[PDB]
Recover the amino acids of this structure.
């Protein structure tokens, strides 16, 4: 009985840690995604404007 | 030597530039030698920029262009009902001349803030998943958004057919679709009998870009004539994204400063002009109202693109449709989570307002507790009942094509589901129960159906529960 | 000699050629009044704003309305001043557009009324006040956890369903009651239906008699949608400079101001910048924001609703807007559904003023303690939802007991809620609210039921409500 | 500077060392000027003639029969982006490259050389020796495996790895720390004096660590030491 | 006459073009009809490009422009101490005119390689964390970097206050700050008594971009006057990010092609030639020094962005302020991991080292 | 090719099949000629008239009362990006869509006809 209680406590704590790590990873990846998005938009519009004022 | 003619300097890609026409108006309509129309957009210091509304290949440098003296306008009138016309008003169904007597300009000011009235009348779409969770009211403008081949056209056709008994005039605008698809739609409407109060405006994909760019404005111009005389008009746009693409083509070919994604500066101004002309008029002006249902195409579910974001900001509500949910048997496939309607409540009858309050919470609970559904079969207090009820809800939301359900029957079935009468019937028997319930009601529930239709309010609890229990006993469980 | 002529029309952008030696200045307003000479023309009533000097005696202008029907060569008149809008008591209770013309059907303003230019430089360095003051709004949550600053800018985060209009109306009512200052609402890029609803709400509430409303709606050209905020600001600045009042200014959505500026820049043909915005983004935002300040005789305080594109707080428009803010107010659907009004988030809401130097040691300590207690309650939510309340530790039980009292006491009964609830409103001074929160934290009222703290205002009314129930 | 060095390389036949403190500023200045000369902008705003100018500079720095020039050039990487055209074009002109990494710098690992991205044409069995080549390849393999394990280790910890992968991690962390070194010139940053480690000692130390002869020592004992013996010296008197 | 007089042909967005002005030199100050000053930027074949350093609404095509004969320069002197001026040297506090007698050019060469000396004298900031972990010496260029609302302005003000007893002259340059904040900062310094030895140069957000672009150069030019006479000067820039934004705006208005993040190619040369003028001079040169503390604002704490990396490449170390650590109650939230002082250690007193 | 097929349709009343391989090449040829003709490129470097040209081609393939033309068209997907304008513009023209899934293609199981990504009217 003691061993089973310990097993479920260990699962609870470890799985809590896993979920928290997943949330932090998602937050950092979202920041990277936003930076990439802004960079892509800027580069696209810059190239279009250069090709437009080329004439 | 006159100021009312001109000679063409440059021809190519559906636009032209002319020397002369010193007295033309900005936005005027012009006529070429071979007979195709044109629009003056850019009035340079010494030349005029003209977009060509037709087959330009017959135009050569050096031929003559003439004034017409009219800002672009379209015919209006009750004669257009039942016809299929292009944005210039010329019929394409082949059934002879259209026989109009009146005209209305393409660009007219929207009703002022003091001429409008709060939305209070319901627009019955006939779809349970919409009339339950995402209300639409007369005067409201609602965005219907989804990926390609998800059912938007089917939803629009169902809505247009469902207005048969209402005192409403329906307008359908087709931008950038196959002529085969447009003809199939016209055949379906004539088959169901909706083509005696409907106007269809067509601008197919092979057509020049300006006709696509002008089609929705022709639609709103035709609708406003009925709206201002005291009637209710419903307008559907098939592809505002194709509208935007056509305008982008015109702008870039006229060499205006390109913005983000090569779109011109005033694309938001264009869509705001289009979607701010639908409103519910104040009583002093008249009882009329106009409601608009623009469509937007999502590339693989992306909703953050420039045009979709503009339209989402402009409109009053969203309905989201998903391919996977369509594949999962949810035929109308409304993702009730992130769809919304800002005019909810005032756009619903009393009975629907009473019966739809519980449904959203149950559906949200199912959607958020789905984590215990695929991996599950474990005892629990809520999820053992919450997921069980949510599955029944999702099964009830489903509907079959071209069979709009009256609002009273929607009320009755939603009441039955929300009161737990489905809690024992098998999930694959849920739809059978729904069909049997409508079939049972049409004969054994007149005192409920007519009571709802007359009072807009729920029947007596005793009688309603007695009838439901009688049918529930009559039911057969497979 | 003030006669020019249209020479080029490119949509919203119109080019006018004036006689040499009579060019109008930048930002000046030009008017066109053309009557149809024959049946092949249309009537024109259009106003233009100067943008650039292109050389060769030519002016590049931005139109404030639809340019359809213009013909090259018609006459254009220079007014000799920027757009001018009426100021004074005549603007209270009226609705205007950007040009300063009344939109409501009540009638026009006589030409003899005083009018002020839209474009003016910001107040000088020595005309500013040298000290920080608190703006006592009389709302418990705002006064305690996120104080407002005379002359500061406050961003309002939320949406529909969270009583944003109710909060705005209550702010207008409380300010006009306790300070004598009027408010101004500027509808930049507002939906027309929502604007009509807001007008009717204000007329019902009775605050319309002490506010002025300016509307620039989504259907209007970019010039109007860009310049409407400045005419609202001028209408407020008149009262700030002449009456010496404390005036509220509401900007309906300041993001649409920036995107309309971007569209105007694109139309004028200037090169884009990061993620496609105008090069002059920061300069335009600064020229709008720096006129909302507190001077030696009065102040203007701005509550601004902000939209975050793609939910990216690093996007240039929100990034530039946040460089000017002094406070923040978040409206929470959880609280609104739970039953708390005005449903301001006690934790997410922040303020620069919440420091002992600006506010005081007692207030600072009480606010920090309330924040800590609510944070702890937010922590215990999961173990409550799983195990049950009686399973907790004793001190955690006490904290949970006190936290619901605090959460309910942060609610308030607004005056503008009377028309529905039937309960008279209340204005709570900051000293009363800080004292009440101190009493609740010190455990003096742990025996009263939590429902006595629902909607009371001062700390005496919760005692009275509990005594009346039992 | 290149002309001054070429004189000694050609006329007198000296062996010449050449240091260039930052060669990226050369192309940056080229881009600064290019707009005003009337040229059209290139991919990321650089000049259209980026590759040609850099080539014309770089092919002069070479060793001929008359003399030998060995060049060490420090290259800047804007915004830590190794795909930028200026760093991307310089790669083809080099024989041995060391890629420094901000992540390794923040972990306190100095010098912050990425052990995988760094390359050299001199790492062949017939040049450095069979034993040296084997040890190098094995170290790179272990670090590659550790790099692959990062996602699992971060998402759910080391408790669910297999026994072999745990041993891989145990070796890899110690090896990664042992690649750090205390420099002579870092005397002014920290009071610890520098060290000079011969290549034979380096090879032997890494061979010993791979064989598992130091699995028991704490990982912090391997940081900034130099010779492998100093690892044991530091493990003693640290509490072990 | 078209030799020392010109005529405007284009006006827009703070940029003007003038016909004539045959003898004007590049970088000269030109005075418009209504008293607004400009700077001759480009001398083309037939027209001169002028950047307007002020409100350009009152300038009209056809207006007359006059030469001044002076390279872009600002006044300097002891009379400037305790005053608040705009980058052109005109007072804005309303306490009367400034009685300086001599000026210095905006663009001036930096000290050479053989003119400098190693940094060895400590600059005491009065903040325990900085003075113990990340020390700063006189003549050092140290960067302070962090997100908004992390106390950068407060750190600068504390440093300036602590110099009351040390022999030092403080120059606080405010680029793009709100005028309310600048007023409050001036009042705090006045109350604590820091205006015995301080000059405040301000260019608020409502000002046209060229003034924001010029302000740090005006500040460093004011500092160099004392620096070359044997005194010790401290210069603080409220943020170089807003100057970079102003310069990007100006370049895009001049239609120069943008690069990474739409910044122009010379955005590195914009800051390098500014931060290279702060140095510790040698004994033969006089022994004076100039210490600079530029500020840079990040987005979500990313130090890998273009401008933060550019500025880190120039300065001699940086102090990173941690936003969430600041939110946790430790207000001088110094991220010890990311903060380094390259020329420190030798610039610290013997007692603190142990 | 389409001109050759239209004769068999209209003149003889037959039923015809038209096999077109790599529509993507047909789009790319126009995208190349646009730059040389000197027109400002679209969002991803494509020509401004992409939709108009593709419509003017595709809409000629219809069934009329005289006869019918059925067309089977192969489309290379650039880097598996279905959001590219060339496939995005094609989707609004096809009655039946077969997707050759890379997941099935690269696991060794062919013809990689996706049983569930396929759509059909
Ligand atoms: N409620 C429904 N019941 C049954 N079938 C439905 C329903 N809604 C949609 N469908 C089916 O889904 C498919 C796609 O629907 P629809 O033809 O309306 O496409 P769409 O999303 O409007 O696409 P397009 O972009 O081509 O206009 C059709 O086969 C249609 O029969
Ligand atoms: N050392 C400190 N001790 C106590 N409070 C502090 C300290 N530093 C900053 N604060 C508080 O934090 C606030 C942050 O404002 P401050 O202008 O100093 O920071 P900032 O990051 O430079 O701001 P910004 O760039 O937005 O103007 C201060 O107004 C003060 O209330
Ligand atoms: Mg469709
Ligand atoms: Mg600060």
């Amino acid at each position: 009985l003691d061993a089973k209680a310990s097993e479920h406590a260990a699962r609870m704590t470890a799985m809590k840690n896993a979920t928290d790590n997943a949330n932090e990873l998602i937050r950092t990846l979202t920041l990277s995604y936003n930076r990439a998005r802004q960079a892509a938009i800027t580069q696209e519009i810059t190239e279009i404007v250069a090709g437009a004022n080329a004439l | 030597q006159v100021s009312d003619v001109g000679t063409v300097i440059q021809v190519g890609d559906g636009i032209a530039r002319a020397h002369g026409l010193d007295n033309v108006m900005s936005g005027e309509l012009v006529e070429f030698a071979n007979g195709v129309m044109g629009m003056a957009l850019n009035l340079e210091e010494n030349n005029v920029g003209i977009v060509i509304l037709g087959p330009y290949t017959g135009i050569k440098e050096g031929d003559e262009v003439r004034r017409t003296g009219r800002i672009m306008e379209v015919p209006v009138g009750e004669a257009l009902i039942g016809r299929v016309v292009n944005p210039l008003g010329q019929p394409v169904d082949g059934l002879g001349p259209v026989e109009t007597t009146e005209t209305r300009p393409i660009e007219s000011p929207a009703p002022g803030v003091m001429d409008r009235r709060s939305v209070h009348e319901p627009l019955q779409t006939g779809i349970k998943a919409i009339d339950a969770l995402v209300p639409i009211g007369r005067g409201q403008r609602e965005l219907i958004i989804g990926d390609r081949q998800t059912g938007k056209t089917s939803v629009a056709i169902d809505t247009i057919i469902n207005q048969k008994d209402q005192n409403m005039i329906s307008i359908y605008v087709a931008i950038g679709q196959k002529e085969s698809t447009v003809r199939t739609v016209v055949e379906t409407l004539r088959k169901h009998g909706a083509l005696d109060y409907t106007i269809v405006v067509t601008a197919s994909a092979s057509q020049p870009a300006p006709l696509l760019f002008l089609a929705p404005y022709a639609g709103v111009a035709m609708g406003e004539y009925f709206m201002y005389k005291g009637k209710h008009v419903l307008v559907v746009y098939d592809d505002l994204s194709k509208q935007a693409a056509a305008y982008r083509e015109l702008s870039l070919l006229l060499r205006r400063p390109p913005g983000r994604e090569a779109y011109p500066g005033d694309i938001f101004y264009l869509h705001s002009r289009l979607l701010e002309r639908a409103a519910k008029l104040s009583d002093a002006k008249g009882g009329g109202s106009l409601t608009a249902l623009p469509f937007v195409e999502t590339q693989a579910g992306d909703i953050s693109a420039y045009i979709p974001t503009n339209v989402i900001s402009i409109t009053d509500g969203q309905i989201f449709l998903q391919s996977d949910l369509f594949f999962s048997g949810v035929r109308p496939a409304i993702n009730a989570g992130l769809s919304v309607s800002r005019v909810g409540g005032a756009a619903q009858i009393k009975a629907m307002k009473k019966v739809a309050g519980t449904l959203r919470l149950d559906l949200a609970a199912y959607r958020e507790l789905e984590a215990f559904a695929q991996f599950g079969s474990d005892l629990d207090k809520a999820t053992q009942a919450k997921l069980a009820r949510g599955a029944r809800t999702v099964e009830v939301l489903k509907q079959d094509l071209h069979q709009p359900i009256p609002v009273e029957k929607q009320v009755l079935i939603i009441y039955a589901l929300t009161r737990g009468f489905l809690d024992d019937i098998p999930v694959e028997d849920v739809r059978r129960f729904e069909k049997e319930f409508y079939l049972f009601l049409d004969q054994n529930g007149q005192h409920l159906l007519e009571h709802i239709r007359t009072t807009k309010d729920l029947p007596n609890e005793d009688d309603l529960n007695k009838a439901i229990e009688a049918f529930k006993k009559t039911f057969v469980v497979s | 000699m003030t006669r020019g002529r249209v020479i080029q029309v490119m949509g919203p952008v119109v080019d006018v050629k004036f006689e040499n030696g009579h060019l109008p200045a930048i930002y000046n307003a030009l008017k066109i009044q053309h009557k149809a000479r024959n049946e092949n023309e249309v009537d024109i009533d259009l106003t233009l704003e100067v943008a650039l000097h292109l050389g060769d005696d030519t002016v590049r202008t931005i139109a404030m309305a639809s340019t359809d029907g213009l013909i090259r060569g018609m006459e254009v008149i220079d007014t000799g001043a920027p757009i001018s809008v009426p100021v004074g008591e005549v603007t209270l209770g009226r609705v205007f557009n950007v040009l300063g013309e009344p939109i409501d059907l009540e009638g026009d303003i006589p030409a003899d009324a005083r009018r002020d230019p839209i474009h003016r430089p910001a107040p000088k360095f020595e005309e500013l006040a040298t000290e920080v003051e608190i703006l006592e709004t009389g709302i418990k949550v705002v006064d305690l956890l996120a104080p407002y600053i005379k002359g500061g800018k406050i961003g309002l985060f939320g949406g529909a369903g969270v009583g944003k209009t109710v909060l705005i109306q209550e702010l207008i009512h409380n300010i006009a009651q306790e300070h004598g200052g009027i408010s101004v609402f500027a509808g930049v890029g507002e939906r027309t239906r929502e604007g009509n609803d807001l007008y009717h709400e204000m007329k019902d509430s009775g605050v319309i008699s002490k506010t002025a409303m300016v509307f620039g709606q989504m259907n209007e050209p970019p010039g109007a949608r860009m310049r409407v905020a400045l005419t609202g600001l001028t209408m407020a600045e008149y009262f700030r400079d002449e009456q010496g009042q404390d005036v509220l200014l509401f900007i309906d959505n300041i993001f649409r101001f920036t995107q309309a500026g971007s569209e105007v820049s694109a139309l004028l043909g200037r090169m884009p910048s990061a993620v496609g915005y105008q090069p002059t983004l920061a300069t335009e935002m600064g020229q709008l924001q720096e006129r909302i300040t507190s001077t030696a005789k009065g102040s203007i305080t701005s509550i601004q609703a902000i939209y975050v594109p793609a939910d990216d707080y690093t996007d240039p428009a929100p990034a530039t807007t946040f460089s000017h803010l002094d406070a923040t107010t978040n409206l929470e659907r959880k609280l609104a559904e739970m039953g708390i009004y005005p449903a301001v988030d006690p934790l997410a809401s922040t303020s620069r003023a919440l420091a002992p130097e600006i506010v005081g040691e007692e207030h600072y300590q009480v606010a920090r303690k309330v924040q800590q207690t609510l944070q702890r309650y937010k922590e215990l939510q999961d173990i409550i939802a799983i195990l049950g309340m009686d399973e907790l530790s004793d001190e955690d039980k006490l904290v949970v007991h006190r936290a619901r009292r605090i959460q309910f006491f942060l609610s308030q009964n607004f005056h503008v809620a009377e028309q529905f609830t039937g309960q008279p409103g209340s204005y709570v001074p900051v000293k009363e609210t800080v004292r009440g929160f101190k009493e609740i934290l010190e455990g003096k009222y742990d025996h009263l039921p939590e429902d006595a703290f629902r909607l009371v205002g001062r700390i005496e009314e919760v005692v009275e409500k509990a005594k009346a129930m039992g | 500077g290149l002309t001054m060095a070429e004189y000694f390389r050609d006329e007198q036949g000296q062996d010449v060392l050449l240091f260039i403190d930052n060669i990226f500023r050369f192309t940056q200045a080229g881009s600064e000027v290019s707009a005003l000369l009337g040229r059209m902008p290139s991919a990321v705003g650089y000049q259209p003639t980026l590759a040609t100018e850099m080539g014309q500079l770089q092919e002069r720095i070479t060793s001929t029969a008359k003399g030998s020039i060995t060049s060490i050039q420090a290259i800047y990487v804007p915004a830590d982006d190794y795909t930028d055209p200026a760093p991307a074009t310089t790669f083809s002109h080099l024989d041995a490259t060391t890629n420094l990494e901000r992540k390794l710098a923040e972990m306190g690992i100095y010098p912050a050389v990425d052990p995988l991205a760094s390359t050299s044409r001199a790492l062949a069995p017939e040049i450095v020796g069979e034993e040296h080549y084997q040890v190098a390849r094995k170290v790179q393999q272990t670090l590659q495996r550790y790099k692959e394990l990062q996602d699992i280790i971060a998402i759910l910890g080391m408790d669910e790895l297999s026994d072999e992968d745990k041993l891989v991690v145990h070796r890899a962390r110690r090896i990664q720390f042992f690649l750090s070194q205390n420099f002579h010139v870092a005397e002014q940053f920290t009071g610890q004096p520098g060290s000079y480690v011969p290549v034979k000692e380096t090879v032997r130390g890494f061979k010993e660590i791979l064989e598992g002869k130091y699995d028991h020592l704490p990982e912090d004992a391997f940081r900034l030491v130099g010779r492998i013996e100093e690892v044991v010296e530091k493990a003693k008197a640290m509490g072990v």
Remarks:
- The CA atoms of residues 91 and 212 of chain C lie 6 Å apart.
- The two ends of chain C are 83 Å apart (CA to CA).
- The pocket of magnesium ion (ligand 3) is lined by residues B 152-153, 238 (CB under 6 Å).
- The first strand of chain C starts at residue 3 and ends at 10.
